[PDB]
């Protein structure tokens, strides 16, 4: 079976939790802590291994942006450090193409990155690629048809409705149709032929709205809203369904986990995290 892994996050300070949720039986397992607490990180999976990428340790002892890449092996329940990125990237987005990890955007102090870099597990090496056309932190990233999409975020002055696409064989970014909603710190994922953008912050309010981009029609369409307004949510896909994990609603650090069924176009509550938190990294792989 396959589990939904949530790594890190934020409640009062950055967290080192790694916990796994099993959709088949409702259960949560607490597994080995991150070596370094971090919020604003991304999770991804390559070759059955879980990776935690970037973030920031917000701690009473000081605040440190992370250039770290760390690898969790479910077989051993151990974290191993990998090569660090060129730069710290808090509020990062990541996507996997052809067994390589793309690290996109994020912040280092007041630096809002447009830069993008690619990790090759077989060589344990990062290399920079073409930068985005826009500086983006709190950027949503998704992969569809071996193309990489960067969606919304914050450019240092404004939250963004814009999005762009990276064409690996041209090493080139191009704008796509902008979303119907400004979204920073949203959850972005892919399901079937569509990129979904769920929640986020629009500059004024946390959002419950959810819209999806069909690459064949180049248009964004709203689907049913989530039950909870949320920014800095985790999102993943498990068995053809979107799961959104935690985030912040303007009032509470949510423990709510909601699940979207695209056939009924409905959201439902499925479980709650063991504790409320925002800014987690999420991905899916085999059980330990
Ligand atoms: C209430 N606290 C501070 C938290 O919940 C929190 C804590 C740590 C980390 C994050 C986080 C994670 C990912 C992205 C972003 N992000 N990136 C950009 C913007 C923006 O406001 O535009 C944001 C905010 C809306 C979520 C933040 C949020
Ligand atoms: Cl932060």
Curated annotation (Swiss-Prot):
Q: Where in the cell is it found?
A: Cytoplasm; Nucleus
| Name of the protein described by the UniProt record | Kelch-like ECH-associated protein 1
Report the sequence similarity comment from the record.
Belongs to the KEAP1 family.
Q: How is it modified after translation?
A: Non-enzymatic covalent modifications of reactive cysteines by electrophile metabolites inactivate the BCR(KEAP1) complex. Accumulation of fumarate promotes the formation of cysteine S-succination (S-(2-succinyl)cysteine), leading to inactivate the BCR(KEAP1) complex and promote NFE2L2/NRF2 nuclear accumulation and activation. Nitric oxide-dependent 8-Nitro-cGMP formation promotes cysteine guanylation (S-cGMP-cysteine), leading to NFE2L2/NRF2 nuclear accumulation and activation.
Residue spans of the Kelch repeats:
3-48, 49-99, 100-146, 147-193, 195-240, 241-287
Primary role: Substrate-specific adapter of a BCR (BTB-CUL3-RBX1) E3 ubiquitin ligase complex that regulates the response to oxidative stress by targeting NFE2L2/NRF2 for ubiquitination. KEAP1 acts as a key sensor of oxidative and electrophilic stress: in normal conditions, the BCR(KEAP1) complex mediates ubiquitination and degradation of NFE2L2/NRF2, a transcription factor regulating expression of many cytoprotective genes.
Q: How does it assemble?
A: Component of the BCR(KEAP1) E3 ubiquitin ligase complex, at least composed of 2 molecules of CUL3, 2 molecules of KEAP1, and RBX1. Interacts with NFE2L2/NRF2; the interaction is direct. Forms a ternary complex with NFE2L2/NRF2 and PGAM5. Interacts with (phosphorylated) SQSTM1/p62; the interaction is direct and inactivates the BCR(KEAP1) complex by sequestering it in inclusion bodies, promoting its degradation. Interacts with NFE2L1. Interacts with BPTF and PTMA. Interacts with MAP1LC3B. Interacts indirectly with ENC1. Interacts with SESN1 and SESN2. Interacts with HSP90AA1 and HSP90AB1.
Q: Mark the residues carrying the PTM S-cGMP-cysteine.
A: 110
- List the lineage, top down: Eukaryota, Metazoa, Chordata, Craniata, Vertebrata
Q: What is known of its domains?
A: The Kelch repeats mediate interaction with NFE2L2/NRF2, BPTF and PGAM5.
Residues at the site labelled Sensor for electrophilic agents = 110
The record lists the effect of residue 91 to M as: Impaired interaction with NFE2L2/NRF2
Full protein stretch here: 325 to 612 of 624
Query: Knockout: what is the outcome?
Result: Early postnatal lethality caused by abnormal cornification. Mice survive until weaning and probably die from malnutrition resulting from hyperkeratosis in the esophagus and forestomach that cause gastric obstruction. Defects are caused by constitutive activation Nfe2l2/Nrf2, leading to constitutive expression of phase 2 detoxifying enzymes. Mice lacking both Nfe2l2/Nrf2 and Keap1 reverse the hyperkeratosis phenotype and are healthy and viable in normal conditions.
């Amino acid at each position: 079976g396959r589990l939904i892994y949530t790594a890190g996050g934020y409640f009062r300070q950055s967290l080192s939790y790694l916990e796994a949720y099993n959709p088949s039986n409702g259960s949560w397992l607490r597994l080995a802590d991150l070596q370094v607490p971090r919020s604003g990180l991304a999770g991804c999976v390559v070759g059955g291994l879980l990776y935690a990428v970037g973030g920031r340790n917000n701690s009473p002892d000081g605040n440190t942006d992370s250039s770290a890449l760390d690898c969790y092996n479910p077989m051993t329940n151990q974290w191993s450090p990998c090569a660090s990125m060129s730069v710290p990237r808090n509020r990062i987005g990541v996507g996997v193409i052809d067994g390589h990890i793309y690290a996109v955007g994020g912040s280092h102090g007041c630096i809002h990155h447009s830069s993008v870099e690619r990790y090759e597990p077989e060589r344990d090496e990062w290399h920079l690629v073409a930068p985005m056309l826009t500086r983006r932190i709190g950027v949503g990233v998704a992969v569809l048809n071996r193309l990489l999409y960067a969606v919304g975020g914050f450019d240092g002055t404004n939250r963004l409705n814009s999005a762009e696409c990276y064409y690996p064989e041209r090493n080139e970014w191009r704008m796509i149709t902008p979303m119907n909603t400004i979204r920073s710190g949203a959850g972005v994922c892919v399901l079937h032929n569509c990129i979904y953008a769920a929640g986020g912050y629009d500059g004024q309010d946390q959002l419950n709205s959810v819209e999806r981009y069909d690459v064949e029609t180049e248009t964004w369409t709203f689907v049913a809203p989530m039950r909870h307004h949320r920014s800095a949510l985790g999102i993943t896909v498990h068995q053809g369904k979107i799961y959104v994990l935690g985030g912040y609603d303007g009032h509470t650090f949510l423990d709510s986990v909601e699940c979207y069924d695209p056939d009924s176009d409905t959201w439902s509550e499925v479980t709650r995290m063991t504790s409320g938190r925002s800014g987690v990294g999420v991905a899916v792989t085999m059980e330990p």
